[PDB]
Amino acid sequence: MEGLAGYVYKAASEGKVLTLAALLLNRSESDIRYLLGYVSQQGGQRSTPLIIAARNGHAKVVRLLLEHYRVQTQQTGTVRFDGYVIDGATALWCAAGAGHFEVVKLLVSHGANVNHTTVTNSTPLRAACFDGRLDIVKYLVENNANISIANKYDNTCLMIAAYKGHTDVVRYLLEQRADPNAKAHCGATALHFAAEAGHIDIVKELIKWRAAIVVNGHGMTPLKVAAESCKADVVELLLSHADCDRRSRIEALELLGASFANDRENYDIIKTYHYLYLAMLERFQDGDNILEKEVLPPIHAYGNRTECRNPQELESIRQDRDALHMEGLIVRERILGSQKWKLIGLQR
Amino acid sequence: MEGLAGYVYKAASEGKVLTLAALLLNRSESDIRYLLGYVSQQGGQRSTPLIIAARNGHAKVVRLLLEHYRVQTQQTGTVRFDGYVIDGATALWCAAGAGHFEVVKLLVSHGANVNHTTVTNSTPLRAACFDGRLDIVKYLVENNANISIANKYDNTCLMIAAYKGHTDVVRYLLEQRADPNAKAHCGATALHFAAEAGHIDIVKELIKWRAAIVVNGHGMTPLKVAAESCKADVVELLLSHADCDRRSRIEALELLGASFANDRENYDIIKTYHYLYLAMLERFNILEKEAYGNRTECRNPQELESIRQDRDALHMEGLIVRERILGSQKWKLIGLQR
């Protein structure tokens, strides 16, 4: 009966409804309950015939197990998604993460908990916003998915939708009273992830929904992380949308300019100089009260190398591909004072 | 495990460095990024273990988190100082404000941005002048802290030092080429604040550095602000020291007198009559005076004498001349925050 569990999982995973039905016919429901509750290990995943079938889109197998062998939707396995290992995953969760709307439709109609949480505390709803499948998104919340359950890292459906550019999902969740101002563990809001990824449509949608402007846990506003991530269009939307002060306008322009320069041989030397110079023009608009650039402390000075402190010194290295890379490094340290921890919270 | 986060925060709170260091022994990298980035909500404050450590002076804990666990000095929180909510406060901003000197250069030496601005554009420099801690002030300036980074209401570190009466910090700032003539959103200069608070030693210093006596947002010179704040020492200095117009002398004295008669049940009628009586000592070519109901300003000294003991009529004469000369303070005070 041990290896009989080998053939049940094979037939369910491959979608062979007629094969699976034959292996279960005329067996005790002590053995039937044993076989459909067996957790197999194969492609790095531990799951039941219910889960692997749901994960693979095999609806006729899912319908057979649900309504004919009366399998509990509660059962949880551990699956692989986007390189991540996800413990405590239900068949509902897998189905929503792989875009199997009719697998999701069956499982719900047989009473599956659409708010069941993985060990990552990820929900079927979250798994669906990850992929931006708005049809599954609308259906789950229509069947009472809590749009406010964040993952272990306090990351929200709205956050990951905003990060991956799913405009339609972002707009929908806000219509469903999603909280615009929730803060993840790192402190970012949905506006931070949208800005950092360059999705200007979602930036517009977030501000039109009265999204608050805040700093994350490292002193960064959406304007600043948009500038560090070199999202020039977002930077120039935010440089006028709010009433950011003179100092905020200069630092965004300088962080933006510096961010263009990191791959030393190939960066656009024009756009680097262009945003660096626009900042100094602003720094010098009044010839009497000049916003002088801050000097680095002596114990952190870049040797005999100093930031250009006037328009002419900047024009002096305008064509020097290497000197402008040096400038960017100084500007970023003079302003910005890892990504692994922010990526793990954006996970499905 | 989310309860373990709070235990690490509690340890960094009380400076209990050793029970903290052990709470992080034998632990994953993913876990410490969770435990050392965890924003805990104690009271109205939101802060990480690095920040409340620095806010409470526990240099033992800050170096533990900085050197052993690679916590970035850019960690920002929200903290409560002097009744205000400060967003974007770094660990170095908190230590400079709560006067923790060896924590400050611990952080600065470890590369903490000395010119970090909070959401209110407050700097670690300003946080230290507010408290008048000259040793911390000079250490930041010697590490190139920009003296001219004013807060979002244009309040300079000179201004706050003057207002809070920190004399030796004022003159040190002026020795470092601080612009004495800078104006806040109120239109007020360090001289105005010093006058309003009555710090005669700082009022002397700004003149010694040739600050300008010009009007503010309410159109009032530091002379007139010192007299409205009932600061008799500095009004007498500002008249005597300068070339000041004679009408400036009738006006400063009259207003100084009227301003002592606010709390009418318990105020100095002796001082209210005194200053009003010197005002007409210098009027009565006799310079005459510039009608609410049936109550007009006192003309003759016989009229001022006839109410010398009427606690109420002097109060009314106060309100009357107070409006003749003049005719709010909330955004001035908000700008004077840390």
Answer yes or no: do A297 and B144 touch at CB < 8 A. Answer: yes
A218 close contact with B: CB closer than 8 A:
yes
Q: Which residues pair with B313 in a beta bridge?
A: none
Instruction: Determine the Cα–Cα distance for residues A63 and A54; give it in Å rounded to an integer.
Output: 10
Answer yes or no: do A217 and B73 touch at CB < 8 A. Answer: no
Instruction: Determine the Cα–Cα distance for residues B219 and B285; give it in Å rounded to an integer.
Output: 28
How far does the CA of residue A183 sit from the closest CA of chain B (Å)?
Answer: 10
Sign of the CA dihedral running B98, B102, B105, B107 = negative
Q: Which residues of B touch A296 (CB under 8 A)?
A: 144
Answer yes or no: do B143 and A294 touch at CB < 8 A. Answer: no
Answer yes or no: do B37 and A219 touch at CB < 8 A. Answer: no
Instruction: Determine the Cα–Cα distance for residues B277 and B254; give it in Å rounded to an integer.
Output: 8
How far does the CA of residue A338 sit from the closest CA of chain B (Å)?
Answer: 9
Instruction: For the sheet with A76-81, list strands across it.
Output: A40-41, A46-47, A76-81, A84-90
Amino acid at A8: V
Q: Where are the domains of chain B?
A: 1-146
Phi-psi label, residue B308: left if phi above 0, alpha if psi -120 to 50, beta otherwise: alpha
Alpha-carbon dihedral angle through residues B126, B132, B138, B141, given to the nearest 10 degrees: 10
Those of residues 161-180 in B touching chain A at CB distance below 8 A are none
Q: H helices of chain B, where?
A: 2-13, 17-24, 29-35, 49-55, 59-63, 91-97, 101-109, 124-131, 134-142, 157-164, 167-175, 190-197, 200-208, 222-228, 232-241, 247-259, 269-283, 301-305, 311-325, 329-335
B5: how many CB neighbours lie within 10 A of its CB?
A: 19
Locate the chain B residue with the closest alpha carbon to A153: B34
Instruction: Determine the Cα–Cα distance for residues A141 and A155; give it in Å rounded to an integer.
Output: 18
Instruction: Tell me the resolution in Å.
Output: 2.8
Instruction: Determine the Cα–Cα distance for residues A301 and A228; give it in Å rounded to an integer.
Output: 22
A343 close contact with B: CB closer than 8 A:
no
Is A193 strand, coil or helix? helix
Question: Which of A247, A298, A299 is facing B117, going by the closest CB pair?
Answer: A247
Tell me if B68 is assigned to a ligand binding site. Answer: no
Query: Tokens standing for B68?
Result: 């052993």
Comparing CA positions, the residue from B29, B68, B90 lying closest to residue A340 is B29
A244 close contact with B: CB closer than 8 A:
no
Q: Which residues pair with A41 in a beta bridge?
A: A46
Sign of the CA dihedral running B4, B10, B13, B17 = negative
Instruction: Determine the Cα–Cα distance for residues A122 and A155; give it in Å rounded to an integer.
Output: 9
Experimental method, per PDB record? X-ray
Answer yes or no: do B143 and A299 touch at CB < 8 A. Answer: yes
- Is A227 within 8 Å of A244 (Cβ atoms)? no
Q: Which residues pair with B42 in a beta bridge?
A: B45
Answer yes or no: do B119 and A215 touch at CB < 8 A. Answer: yes
Is B115 strand, coil or helix? coil
Burial track B48-57 (b if 16+ CB lie within 10 A, e otherwise)? bbbbbbbbbb
Question: Which of B30, B74, B117 is facing A218, going by the closest CB pair?
Answer: B74
Cα–Cα distances (Å) from B322 to A347, B159, B316, in that order, read 67, 27, 10
Query: Tokens standing for A101?
Result: 């709307």
Is A81 strand, coil or helix? strand
Phi-psi label, residue A121: left if phi above 0, alpha if psi -120 to 50, beta otherwise: left
DSSP letter (8 states) at residue A66: I
List Cβ neighbours of B208 (8 Å cut-off, separation of 6 or more): none
Is B221 strand, coil or helix? coil
CA A178 to chain centre: 16
Domain A156-244 has CATH 3.40.50.720: no
Phi-psi label, residue A47: left if phi above 0, alpha if psi -120 to 50, beta otherwise: beta
Locate the chain A residue with the closest alpha carbon to B143: A297
Terminal C-alpha separation, chain A: 36
Which CATH number applies to B1-146?
Answer: 1.25.40.20
Burial track A117-137 (b if 16+ CB lie within 10 A, e otherwise)? bbebebbbbbbbbbbbbbebb
DSSP letter (8 states) at residue B292: B
DSSP letter (8 states) at residue B187: S
Instruction: Determine the Cα–Cα distance for residues A112 and B177; give it in Å rounded to an integer.
Output: 72
Q: What is the CA radius of gyration of chain B?
A: 26
Q: Which residues of A touch B34 (CB under 8 A)?
A: 153, 185
Q: How many residues does chain A have?
A: 348
What DSSP letter does each residue of A282-342 carry, written as one string? HHTSSSSS--PPPPPPGGG--TT-----SHHHHHTTTT-HHHHHHHHHHHHHHHH--HHHH
Instruction: Determine the Cα–Cα distance for residues A91 and A52; give it in Å rounded to an integer.
Output: 7
B327: how many CB neighbours lie within 10 A of its CB?
A: 7
Instruction: Determine the Cα–Cα distance for residues A97 and A89; give it in Å rounded to an integer.
Output: 11
Instruction: Determine the Cα–Cα distance for residues A155 and A150; give it in Å rounded to an integer.
Output: 5
Comparing CA positions, the residue from B198, B214, B199, B209 lying closest to residue B172 is B209
Instruction: Determine the Cα–Cα distance for residues B200 and B165; give it in Å rounded to an integer.
Output: 9
Terminal C-alpha separation, chain B: 36
Cα–Cα distances (Å) from B53 to B11, B24, B95, in that order, read 9, 16, 9
DSSP letter (8 states) at residue B262: S
- Looking from the CA of B263 toward its CB, the CA atoms found within 13 Å total 3
Comparing CA positions, the residue from B87, B90, B66, B63 lying closest to residue B76 is B90
A154: how many CB neighbours lie within 10 A of its CB?
A: 17
Answer yes or no: do B76 and A218 touch at CB < 8 A. Answer: yes
Instruction: Determine the Cα–Cα distance for residues A190 and A134; give it in Å rounded to an integer.
Output: 18
- Dihedrals φ, ψ of B85, to 5°? -95, 120
- Is A216 within 8 Å of A188 (Cβ atoms)? yes
